[PDB]
Structure formats: C-alpha cells, structure tokens
Assembly symmetry: C3
Homo-oligomer: 124 residues x 3
C-alpha cells in the first residue's frame, strides 16, 4: 500500500526573483510556458505568483531527484476552474517521472511575507 | 495503492496576523473555536500559535480545492496528550471532504523567524 | 491503501542557528553525526546546510509525534550520489518508528532567504 515516490519543498524570495526576471529579458521565457505567464483573464501574471510557480518547479525536480537534463518547459503549472494549481509534466520531466513510476502529482503554493513556497508530492 | 487526495501549504506572517486580530475584535471568534483559543493549562493561546492554526486552516482548505461556503469553525486543530496537533473536520468542511473521499488528515505546524507555517495532507 | 503515518515541517532561521553553534562548542556534535558535518569533498558543511539538517530532524520528530527520549544522533541525513538527501534512522528514533509502523521516509530540504526549511513524511 506504499505509494509516495518523492517529496519536494522550495522557497523563493519574491523580490530577488523579480530582480532576476528584470535583469535578463530571456529568463521568463526559459522558465515558463506562455500559458503560465498569464492570468485566467489574459493579463500578465505577477512576480509573486511566478515566484511560486518557480518554487513549484524546483520542488518537482527535488521530488524526482533532480537529475540533469530536465527542461523547465516540460513542467507546467495549470489551474482548475475552481482555482486549484495543478502539475502537468511532459518530455524530459515525464520521462524521469516514468523511470520512477510516478502516476500522480500533488502541489500546493503560497506567497506571503515576501516568500513564495511550494510543496510537491509524487505518488505512484 | 494510491491514497493522497490533496496537499496544502500556508505561511502566515505572525506580526501581521496579530495586528489583524487586534484591529477587529470579532475576528478571533470567527476564525477559531473556543477550544483553539486556549492552551491546555487554560490560559489564552498566543499570537504565533494562533497564526499557525490559521495557516493550518488555509492549508486544509487548499488540500480540498478551497470551494466556497466552508466555515472556519468547521475545522478544528486539537492536541494529543503527547502534544501532536490534529485536525478534526465537521459540517461544511467534512461534507467537502466526503465529496473527495478523504478518510485521514495529516498536519504539522511550525512558528519561527516570525512566520507560522503549516502543511496538510488529505488521504483516502 | 492508506499509508501515511505522519508529516512534519520545520523552519530554522539560519543566522540564529549559526550563532547557537558558535556560542556552545559542544552543540554541533550533539546534533550531528561526523558524516553530516562534512561535504562530499571532505570540507566542513556550512551553516545554512546544517540548519536545513536540523530542520529535517525537528520535522522527523514531529512526524513521529516527538516523544521524549529520542537522540539527535539516531537520525542521519545522508546523500545519494545524485544529490538527493535521505533519512536513515537507528536506535531510539527507529524504535519509535517501529511502534508506529513506519517503513519509508521521505525528506526534502530548502535553504534560501536566510531560512532553512524541511518537510518529512513517514509512510508504512
Ligand atoms: C538541486 C536543486 C533542486 C536545489 O534547489 P535550489 O532552489 O537551488 O536550492 P534549495 O536551497 O532550495 O535546495 C537545496 C537542497 O536541495 C537538496 N538537493 C540537492 N540535490 C538534490 C537532488 N538531486 N534531488 C533532490 N534534492 C536535492 C539538498 O538537500 C540541498 O541542500 P543541501 O546541499 O544543504 O543538502 C537545484 O539546484 C536544481 O538542480 N534544480 C533543477 C531544476 C530543474 O531541473 N528544473 C527543470 C524541470 S522542472
Ligand atoms: C485560495 C486561498 C486558500 C489562498 O490562500 P491565501 O492564504 O489567501 O493565499 P496564499 O498566497 O497562501 O495562496 C495562494 C495560492 O493558493 C492557490 N489556490 C488558489 N485557489 C485555490 C483553490 N481553489 N484550491 C487550492 N489552492 C488554491 C493558488 O496557487 C494561489 O497562488 P497563485 O494565485 O499565485 O497561483 C484563500 O484565498 C481561501 O479562499 N481560503 C479559504 C479558507 C477557508 O475556506 N477556510 C474555512 C474552512 S477551514
Ligand atoms: C515539539 C518540537 C518538535 C517543536 O519543534 P520546534 O522547532 O521547537 O518548534 P516549532 O515552532 O517548529 O513547532 C512548534 C509546533 O510543533 C507542534 N508540536 C508540539 N509537540 C508535538 C509533538 N509531540 N508531535 C508533533 N508536533 C508537535 C505544535 O503544533 C507546535 O506549535 P503549537 O504549540 O503552537 O501548536 C520540539 O520542541 C521538540 O520536542 N523536538 C524534539 C527533537 C528530537 O526529538 N530530536 C531528536 C531525534 S531526531
Ligand atoms: K498509499
Ligand atoms: Mg530553492
Ligand atoms: Mg496564505
Ligand atoms: Mg521549529
């Protein structure tokens, strides 16, 4: 009845992360899919919210043992109608997930007190 | 053998939370059951400890997909003889939990460096 | 198909933790096994990294309901070739783990923004 394959936690300082995006124009497009960079309404997603998604991808990597060769764009945080964040993995991340037998992904995000936090659990 | 239904994490800045309780007298009684507002000895529970319980309820909500209509007073953090915090859900929260098939609740709390953190896992 | 026995989260302020180690020479050897105090290369492990391991041990204790009589040196954070942190429990911690039926340990560590965080899940 055992099913947890890995867990990850990650914490990002929002202000630092925002500074990093502003300094290198190409960075946001390297870390995020077009869909993640937008709010449901169509406006550009804000720094704290992006920092939480960055934290989610770091946490996901940790859950998988963070091997080399994983692409940021092969993990996607998407959002249920109800508002709940979800992980979708493709390509390199999905391949690594399959090596370990991961069937289900669980994520939660928080951004408060200028830190963005994420927890991720991989189950299979 | 899969059993995780949801996870939640939440982080509350203690000082801000304390300020919010002081500003609106009715707030503490809206967020907490009489039992949560007391220490085992019978003295009033402190701000950092209440902030961690607030974080626990936010995390629990996230674990359930945070639908509308949940009452703060339908989630209760109680404490084992040994000191371990526990979640008890009733009414609206329990009903939502039943929709998703949640049988067991796991929580942990931390308050240090002026932030209160909670993680919650719903299993079934 | 239920298997989660406990979860723990803990957050340590790095600067405070470093101050505590410096103030009392004996503290590091009370909290850590010789192996934890070193980096893979053989150099002394740094404060933030030790703070995350301290957080891991606090989180592990929480996952077990933090009974009296557990030794810090009966929990060991070790490191896979790939870099992933792992928990190994012996003696008092393993005995408590056996009382609860714990078979598997899951940990993740983070140190950023001057806080070290750990999450631990005990499964069985
Ligand atoms: C290893 C990595 C995850 C660390 O995360 P970070 O945000 O840079 O640093 P954090 O302080 O949050 O985490 C550091 C801790 O992660 C842990 N870690 C290191 N390597 C790891 C690995 N292979 N697997 C899981 N955890 C690992 C360690 O415990 C480390 O602390 P320690 O050295 O003191 O023990 C990061 O450097 C990395 O390689 N990220 C890859 C991201 C990626 O692949 N993304 C694309 C796909 S989504
Ligand atoms: C949605 C909610 C949980 C967010 O928590 P918060 O403390 O206000 O804000 P945080 O920064 O900690 O969390 C925000 C993140 O939560 C996530 N979130 C939003 N809606 C969610 C939902 N329906 N389910 C799970 N997670 C959700 C998102 O990832 C969001 O970040 P993002 O917008 O950048 O993606 C909160 O606004 C809420 O509706 N709480 C309800 C509490 C409740 O029902 N209590 C009574 C019963 S205990
Ligand atoms: C109880 C203990 C874990 C608290 O951790 P801490 O870092 O001092 O304090 P934190 O703020 O991070 O956590 C406090 C929260 O832990 C929770 N906690 C207290 N007793 C607990 C127990 N028996 N089991 C699980 N959680 C407990 C409570 O929710 C508490 O907050 P609250 O009083 O406001 O409800 C700690 O005091 C302790 O006894 N550590 C033992 C460590 C140990 O045995 N190590 C050796 C083996 S690795
Ligand atoms: K299971
Ligand atoms: Mg990090
Ligand atoms: Mg919050
Ligand atoms: Mg602590």
């Amino acid at each position: 009845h055992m099913s947890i394959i890995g867990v990850g936690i990650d914490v990002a300082e929002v202000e630092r992360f925002g500074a990093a995006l502003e300094r290198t124009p190409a960075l946001a497009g390297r870390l995020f899919l077009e869909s993640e960079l937008l709010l449901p309404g169509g406006e550009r997603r804000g720094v704290a919210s992006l920092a939480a998604r960055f934290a989610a991808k770091e946490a996901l990597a940790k859950a998988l043992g963070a091997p080399a060769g994983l692409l940021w764009t092969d993990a996607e945080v998407w959002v249920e109608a109800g508002g709940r964040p979800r992980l979708r993995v493709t390509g390199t991340v999905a391949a690594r997930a399959a090596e370990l037998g991961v069937a289900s992904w669980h994520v939660s995000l928080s951004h408060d007190a200028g830190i963005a936090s994420a927890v991720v659990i991989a189950e299979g």
